[PDB]
Design an enzyme around this catalytic site. Structure first.
Site, PDB file in Angstrom:
ATOM      1  N   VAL A  27       0.804  -1.203   0.000  1.00 29.99           N
ATOM      2  CA  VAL A  27       0.000   0.000   0.000  1.00 29.99           C
ATOM      3  C   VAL A  27       0.848   1.269   0.000  1.00 29.99           C
ATOM      4  CG1 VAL A  27      -1.977  -1.112   1.050  1.00 29.99           C
ATOM      5  CG2 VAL A  27      -0.268  -0.053   2.510  1.00 29.99           C
ATOM      6  N   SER A  29       2.354   2.851  -2.141  1.00 27.23           N
ATOM      7  CA  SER A  29       3.414   2.868  -3.160  1.00 27.23           C
ATOM      8  C   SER A  29       4.493   3.942  -2.948  1.00 27.23           C
ATOM      9  CB  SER A  29       2.793   2.958  -4.564  1.00 27.23           C
ATOM     10  OG  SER A  29       1.800   3.965  -4.626  1.00 27.23           O
ATOM     11  N   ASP A 165       3.590   9.376  12.173  1.00 26.71           N
ATOM     12  CA  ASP A 165       4.598  10.125  11.413  1.00 26.71           C
ATOM     13  C   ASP A 165       5.089   9.221  10.304  1.00 26.71           C
ATOM     14  OD1 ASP A 165       6.645  11.666  10.380  1.00 26.71           O
ATOM     15  OD2 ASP A 165       7.498  12.208  12.357  1.00 26.71           O
TER      16      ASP A 165
HETATM   17  N1  6SH Z   1       8.360   7.824  11.778  1.00 25.85           N
HETATM   18  C1  6SH Z   1       8.464   7.276  12.993  1.00 25.85           C
HETATM   19  O1  6SH Z   1       9.547   6.947  13.516  1.00 25.85           O
HETATM   20  C2  6SH Z   1       7.162   7.010  13.713  1.00 25.85           C
HETATM   21  C3  6SH Z   1       7.351   6.809  15.218  1.00 25.85           C
HETATM   22  C4  6SH Z   1       6.121   6.976  16.045  1.00 25.85           C
HETATM   23  C5  6SH Z   1       5.535   8.395  16.074  1.00 25.85           C
HETATM   24  C6  6SH Z   1       4.050   8.316  16.375  1.00 25.85           C
HETATM   25  C7  6SH Z   1       3.424   9.697  16.492  1.00 25.85           C
HETATM   26  C8  6SH Z   1       4.101  10.504  17.539  1.00 25.85           C
HETATM   27  C9  6SH Z   1       5.554  10.652  17.247  1.00 25.85           C
HETATM   28  C10 6SH Z   1       6.231   9.284  17.100  1.00 25.85           C
HETATM   29  N2  6SH Z   1       6.516   5.827  13.090  1.00 25.85           N
HETATM   30  C11 6SH Z   1       5.228   5.843  12.764  1.00 25.85           C
HETATM   31  O2  6SH Z   1       4.497   6.811  13.046  1.00 25.85           O
HETATM   32  C12 6SH Z   1       4.666   4.667  12.025  1.00 25.85           C
HETATM   33  C13 6SH Z   1       3.479   4.816  11.313  1.00 25.85           C
HETATM   34  C14 6SH Z   1       2.903   3.742  10.652  1.00 25.85           C
HETATM   35  C15 6SH Z   1       3.532   2.518  10.623  1.00 25.85           C
HETATM   36  C16 6SH Z   1       2.933   1.360   9.843  1.00 25.85           C
HETATM   37  N3  6SH Z   1       1.550   1.597   9.451  1.00 25.85           N
HETATM   38  C17 6SH Z   1       1.238   2.189   8.299  1.00 25.85           C
HETATM   39  O3  6SH Z   1       2.101   2.549   7.512  1.00 25.85           O
HETATM   40  C18 6SH Z   1      -0.197   2.420   8.025  1.00 25.85           C
HETATM   41  C19 6SH Z   1      -1.324   2.261   8.851  1.00 25.85           C
HETATM   42  N4  6SH Z   1      -2.422   2.800   8.327  1.00 25.85           N
HETATM   43  N5  6SH Z   1      -2.005   3.311   7.109  1.00 25.85           N
HETATM   44  C20 6SH Z   1      -2.967   4.016   6.289  1.00 25.85           C
HETATM   45  C21 6SH Z   1      -3.765   3.319   5.404  1.00 25.85           C
HETATM   46  C22 6SH Z   1      -4.641   4.007   4.579  1.00 25.85           C
HETATM   47  C23 6SH Z   1      -4.737   5.388   4.657  1.00 25.85           C
HETATM   48  C24 6SH Z   1      -3.949   6.080   5.547  1.00 25.85           C
HETATM   49  C25 6SH Z   1      -3.060   5.403   6.367  1.00 25.85           C
HETATM   50  C26 6SH Z   1      -0.685   3.074   6.889  1.00 25.85           C
HETATM   51  N6  6SH Z   1      -0.063   3.417   5.776  1.00 25.85           N
HETATM   52  C27 6SH Z   1       4.717   2.369  11.324  1.00 25.85           C
HETATM   53  C28 6SH Z   1       5.285   3.427  12.007  1.00 25.85           C
END
Ligand code: 6SH
Length: 350
Positions: A27, A29, A165
């Protein structure tokens, strides 16, 4: 008790996952990373599985991997993404080279809810309430998001919202001058390189988002860096005396004096037809002086959220130890710290 894994190729990369996770399909992409949606056979719900890219290639990658895992393991709140599972096909530290993170699968991001159309005031109350509830929790851990924007806010069908994020988690003020995808939601102090940022950089972003939910249009759609600041200052004004007194540098001061003096606009004359309580909250979120900007906890108590606010159900976080961020470790040490956090993971209740 180690599960049995299976291997498949998806978007031209190897995925090796527990049999638990069925019907993998890529998903986003790219907008998400390397992420597949899957069916969780233990729960009957859909999940998202993120495979980290080259997690221990270098010290920087290894520390990034460790950071993300630490942050995800910490977050235990309804309005913040959480970790449902973390796994590796490796049987030992020696062969540990891949990390997969499992979360809830959301339905849409906030751009896909707004679609250039105004939301009802009640819907805006509910959405912003939940963002603020999540942010009270994040900020209580002494974590600042720093890149809040509609694409980092996801909802389900029941309009339940989570903060995420989809970029690289930033951890210090020093990274604000690096890469950024959109600057439409960034606080002016960041854009002006004032440093010493506080948690209400995130409140600025919320104010921008709230405005956009109400009007259906971006509040400050700058064409470039200079234009972004010019649009901001046209609404919020040139700095007042009290704020100028807090600028340490003659040039920034000499700079700040070099832009055309704008008086602050009355927001009641800008958001015509909006709920007066919404306009009052926006005023409190979009203060130029970040020391005077409303906090998440304060905002939750504002009258705008009367129908949703529950002071006994707006929880705070356990303390989060970010002392690692100050450390200089070897690549195998970061790897081992990560491994240990994979091993120690305890799933949330079923
Ligand atoms: N960048 C980073 O280090 C952060 C650290 C946490 C952070 C949280 C907010 C406070 C600050 C700290 N990682 C993430 O946020 C993260 C997000 C998603 C995923 C896997 N799921 C997905 O990718 C996921 C879940 N639904 N849809 C989705 C589906 C359809 C439409 C919209 C979203 C995804 N694409 C793993 C890690």
């Amino acid at each position: 008790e180690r599960p049995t894994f299976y291997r498949q190729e998806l978007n031209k990369t190897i995925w090796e996952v527990p049999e638990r996770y069925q019907n993998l399909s890529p998903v986003g992409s790219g907008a998400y990373g390397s992420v597949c949606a899957a069916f969780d056979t233990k729960t009957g719900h859909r999940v998202a599985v993120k495979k980290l890219s080259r997690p221990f290639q270098s010290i920087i990658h290894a520390k990034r991997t460790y950071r993300e895992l630490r942050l995800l393991k910490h977050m235990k709140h309804e309005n913040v993404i959480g970790l449902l599972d973390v796994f590796t096909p490796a049987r030992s530290l020696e062969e540990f080279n891949d990390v997969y993170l499992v979360t809830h699968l959301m339905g849409a991001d906030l751009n896909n809810i707004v679609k250039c159309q105004k939301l009802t005031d009640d819907h805006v109350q509910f959405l912003i309430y939940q963002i603020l509830r999540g942010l009270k929790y994040i900020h209580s851990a002494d974590i600042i998001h720093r890149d809040l924007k509609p694409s980092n806010l996801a909802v389900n069908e029941d309009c339940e919202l989570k903060i995420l994020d989809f970029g690289l988690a930033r951890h210090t003020d020093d990274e604000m001058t690096g890469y950024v995808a959109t600057r439409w939601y960034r606080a002016p102090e960041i854009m002006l390189n004032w440093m010493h940022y506080n948690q209400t950089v995130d409140i600025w972003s919320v104010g921008c988002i709230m405005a956009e939910l109400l009007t259906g249009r971006t509040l400050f759609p700058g064409t470039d860096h200079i234009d972004q600041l010019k649009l901001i200052l046209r609404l919020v004004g040139t700095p007042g005396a009290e704020l100028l007194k807090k600028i340490s540098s003659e040039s920034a001061r000499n700079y700040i004096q070099s832009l055309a003096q704008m008086p602050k606009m009355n927001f009641a004359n800008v958001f015509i037809g909006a709920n007066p309580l919404a306009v009052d909250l926006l005023e409190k979120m979009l203060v130029l002086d970040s020391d005077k900007r409303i906090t998440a906890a304060q905002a939750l108590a504002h009258a705008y959220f009367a129908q949703y606010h529950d002071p006994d159900d707006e929880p705070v976080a356990d303390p989060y130890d970010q002392s690692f961020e100050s450390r200089d470790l070897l690549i195998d040490e970061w790897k081992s710290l990560t491994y240990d956090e994979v091993i120690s993971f305890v799933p949330p209740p079923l």
